[PDB]
Amino acid sequence: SVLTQSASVSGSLGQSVTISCTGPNSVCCSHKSISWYQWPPGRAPTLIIYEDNERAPGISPRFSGYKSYWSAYLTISDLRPEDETTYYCCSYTHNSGCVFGTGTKVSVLG
Amino acid sequence: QGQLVQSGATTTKPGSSVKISCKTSGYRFNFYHINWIRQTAGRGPEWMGWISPYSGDKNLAPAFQDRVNMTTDTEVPVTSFTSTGAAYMEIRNLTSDDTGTYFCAKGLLRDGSSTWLPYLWGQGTLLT
Amino acid sequence: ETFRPGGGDMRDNWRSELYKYKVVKIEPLGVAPTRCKRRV
Amino acid sequence: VFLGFLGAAGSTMGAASMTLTVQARNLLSGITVWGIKQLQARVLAVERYLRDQQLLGIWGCSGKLICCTNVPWNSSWSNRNLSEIWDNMTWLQWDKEISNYTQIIYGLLEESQNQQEKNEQDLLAL
Amino acid sequence: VFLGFLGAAGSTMGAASMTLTVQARNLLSGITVWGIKQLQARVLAVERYLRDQQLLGIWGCSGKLICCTNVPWNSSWSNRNLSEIWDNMTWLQWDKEISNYTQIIYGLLEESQNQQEKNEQDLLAL
Amino acid sequence: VFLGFLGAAGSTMGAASMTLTVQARNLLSGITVWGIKQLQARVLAVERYLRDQQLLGIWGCSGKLICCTNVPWNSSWSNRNLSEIWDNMTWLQWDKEISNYTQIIYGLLEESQNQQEKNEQDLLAL
Ligand SMILES: *[C@@H]1O[C@H](CO)[C@@H](O[C@@H]2O[C@H](CO)[C@@H](O[C@@H]3O[C@H](CO[C@H]4O[C@H](CO)[C@@H](O)[C@H](O[C@H]5O[C@H](CO)[C@@H](O)[C@H](O)[C@@H]5O)[C@@H]4O)[C@@H](O)[C@H](O[C@H]4O[C@H](CO)[C@@H](O)[C@H](O)[C@@H]4O)[C@@H]3O)[C@H](O)[C@H]2NC(C)=O)[C@H](O)[C@H]1NC(C)=O
Ligand SMILES: *[C@@H]1O[C@H](CO)[C@@H](O)[C@H](O)[C@H]1NC(C)=O
Ligand SMILES: *[C@@H]1O[C@H](CO)[C@@H](O)[C@H](O)[C@H]1NC(C)=O
Ligand SMILES: *[C@@H]1O[C@H](CO)[C@@H](O)[C@H](O)[C@H]1NC(C)=O
Ligand SMILES: *[C@@H]1O[C@H](CO)[C@@H](O)[C@H](O)[C@H]1NC(C)=O
Ligand SMILES: *[C@@H]1O[C@H](CO)[C@@H](O)[C@H](O)[C@H]1NC(C)=O
Ligand SMILES: *[C@@H]1O[C@H](CO)[C@@H](O)[C@H](O)[C@H]1NC(C)=O
Ligand SMILES: *[C@@H]1O[C@H](CO)[C@@H](O)[C@H](O)[C@H]1NC(C)=O
Numbered sequence A: 001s002v003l004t005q006s007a008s009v010s011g012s013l014g015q016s017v018t019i020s021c022t023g024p025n026s027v028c029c030s031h032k033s034i035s036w037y038q039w040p041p042g043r044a045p046t047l048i049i050y051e052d053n054e055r056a057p058g059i060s061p062r063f064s065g066y067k068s069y070w071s072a073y074l075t076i077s078d079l080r081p082e083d084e085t086t087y088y089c090c091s092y093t094h095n096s097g098c099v100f101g102t103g104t105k106v107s108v109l110g
Numbered sequence B: 001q002g003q004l005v006q007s008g009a010t011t012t013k014p015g016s017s018v019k020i021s022c023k024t025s026g027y028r029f030n031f032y033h034i035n036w037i038r039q040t041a042g043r044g045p046e047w048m049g050w051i052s053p054y055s056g057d058k059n060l061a062p063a064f065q066d067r068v069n070m071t072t073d074t075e076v077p078v079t080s081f082t083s084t085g086a087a088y089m090e091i092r093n094l095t096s097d098d099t100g101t102y103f104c105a106k107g108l109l110r111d112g113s114s115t116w117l118p119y120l121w122g123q124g125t126l127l128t
Numbered sequence C: 001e002t003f004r005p006g007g008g009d010m011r012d013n014w015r016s017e018l019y020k021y022k023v024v025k026i027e028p029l030g031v032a033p034t035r036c037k038r039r040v
Numbered sequence D, E, F: 001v002f003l004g005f006l007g008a009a010g011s012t013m014g015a016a017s018m019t020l021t022v023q024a025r026n027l028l029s030g031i032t033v034w035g036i037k038q039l040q041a042r043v044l045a046v047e048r049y050l051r052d053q054q055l056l057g058i059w060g061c062s063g064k065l066i067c068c069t070n071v072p073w074n075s076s077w078s079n080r081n082l083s084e085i086w087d088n089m090t091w092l093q094w095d096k097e098i099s100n101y102t103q104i105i106y107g108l109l110e111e112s113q114n115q116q117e118k119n120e121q122d123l124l125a126l
């Protein structure tokens, strides 16, 4: 919706990608946390990264986060083959809900 | 670290209401919120709302407040730190625009700034 | 299925009132980590 | 709020860590059959208390309720993040997950104190 | 001078506050009828001592004889000037005038310690 | 090395001063005939321990194993050089050579603490 992501980006094995996540001042970013979700097509998602740069349990140290005053970034260091899916970002605070993003499909064809 | 199994693919038609179940296990059900999230065809994913099984309190987006029935049972304790819960979801004015996969999601923590964050999900239910 | 009264083992009597109770031992020492270290 | 004795038993470790003096008060006072059975209890209560005060004394934490040390947290003991311990788990859950390694830590907290004051005796040797 | 045990019992609170280790020594040692009556006394003496050492431990005064705190003196407890307390009244008179409010102060001296080290755990969290 | 309880009993005072927490652990726990004889022992063990912890508390050494003080070493007690004490004599030999003067030192370690905090109460009187 208002949280415009990075449309779509491609990659290659061993390299690192970057997904954008930015919106207007009403949802992003310095006064809101950002969460990143690996979401297979209409299946069971996975919380990767919460409270800007904090990683969920079991998340490989490849995924790193970074939130600026204007846009939040999700890096995927060292692309492994099992990475092709759609990544969503959500803006939230402590007593609110998830303002999901527009999605970004990542390809690893190499 | 438990499962959140849901109901089946109950495909109805506009006008009616649909009740979707969410039976928990493996974790203390009253310690984490149950978020409801949907990914329909026509939009992306949309956050519907979460409900606190302990406080009985409900918070849901204004896009679904006048549509969603969100209730919960009371856990049947299994062990000291385990239980089995049940969360129910309904929608009022149902259309073809609400066709999509629906999931429940246990909250992340019991305190802090990411308490209700949808962390542990179910498997999905295909609507109309 | 037929049921007949009886008893004798007098601990059944005390058990009918001590079912609500249970003895526990407090162990107040807990070790847990944080980003805290003492000075020099 | 004032939950009372063991009130935060089901609360997170971060919430319960603020209500320590509640359980600290009732650890020594309270919240001819049984004259020898009562005296047998009034002696046991002191011995259990002095053991816990003995370990606090040989760790440098004598008089402390929250005491920071020098032993770094071995991830082998529990590879859990900080925000998934104090804002999620209860102190009863934690004591189970650290049941085995609890004896290893008590020794590390000792020599880290005897070497510390041995360094301080040299710090004041001038 | 060396007045002895309770020697400054009739002296001003300022004079007696310098002779504290005198009464501190004889609080735990001293200045089959009675085999069970003697053992009943050797247990009571330790329990009374450990209670007083328990309160000193949860106030941050463990090991202190004169211990300064954070609780400001409520004038409702006693609206007496400083020079009309330590250079006029005796410690026996003072314990009577503060008999009621003595329990209020013991609680204030506790949370002022648990919040203090909770602030210190954050002071060393960097 | 780990010599064990009293392991460095024949070692120099400098070597044994590093193995203090070894003997500190087993001072309170351990390395109807005897029901009243056992209880008679479980009370004596606590009283001997609380006396040693009482002296440490009135010397300012509560919680310390190696504790530096203010009392200067009177050469009349022992006119031995520093390197002929810690690198030559054993703690058993030392306790004999200082057997007489041991009671004098315990009093000097007391008023040097009560005057110290009396000076600190004035240090914070502003
Ligand atoms: C027993 O176990 C249960 C379940 O584990 C514990 O309940 C959980 O407690 C934690 C903290 O105590 C809760 O986290 C907090 O969540 C609030 C969000 O609440 C706000 O929004 C709600 C929806 O709009 C609303 O209900 C709240 O309004 C009040 O009124 C309701 C009436 O229904 C009342 O029940 C509520 O309790 C509210 O008082 C409220 O507006 C969130 O705001 C908190 O974040 C703030 O605080 C933290 C620090 O505490 C801080 O880090 C943040 O930055 C922010 O400042 C906080 O996260 C959690 O929601 C509860 N429920 C769960 C986990 O399901 C219960 O506490 C345990 N009790 C004991 C005694 O052990
Ligand atoms: C749905 O919510 C309404 C709100 O008024 C409540 O009355 C009703 O009980 C809920 N549904 C069921 C089946 O209980
Ligand atoms: C962790 O503990 C093991 C033994 O349990 C030890 O061998 C290892 O060195 C420790 N690691 C750290 C980083 O302390
Ligand atoms: C979070 O905890 C994990 C242990 O499960 C650790 O590997 C990781 O480095 C921690 N991250 C932060 C930001 O503390
Ligand atoms: C402690 O040791 C036992 C040995 O039977 C083992 O089963 C248990 O898993 C250990 N504890 C933890 C937390 O791993
Ligand atoms: C004094 O004590 C009363 C209660 O006894 C309390 O209400 C008041 O706030 C206190 N005043 C000060 C200045 O501490
Ligand atoms: C003296 O004590 C009284 C209380 O009786 C107080 O009101 C006054 O301010 C004090 N004056 C000085 C100078 O301390
Ligand atoms: C303590 O309370 C009693 C209640 O009977 C009262 O008479 C007495 O005056 C109080 N103490 C003081 C110092 O006022």
Ligand SMILES: *[C@@H]1O[C@H](CO)[C@@H](O)[C@H](O)[C@H]1NC(C)=O
Pocket: F073, F074, F075, F076
């Ligand atoms: C040594 O002790 C004696 C009494 O035993 C005392 O008179 C003398 O002043 C002391 N000397 C020093 C230097 O402390």
Ligand SMILES: *[C@@H]1O[C@H](CO)[C@@H](O)[C@H](O)[C@H]1NC(C)=O
Pocket: F079, F080, F081, F082
């Ligand atoms: C060595 O000890 C003796 C006491 O026997 C003392 O007189 C002398 O000053 C000491 N010398 C040094 C260098 O410490």
Ligand SMILES: *[C@@H]1O[C@H](CO)[C@@H](O)[C@H](O)[C@H]1NC(C)=O
Pocket: F096, F097, F098, F099, F100
């Ligand atoms: C202690 O006093 C006795 C008195 O009989 C004396 O023989 C002994 O030499 C004294 N101790 C020392 C170390 O001089």
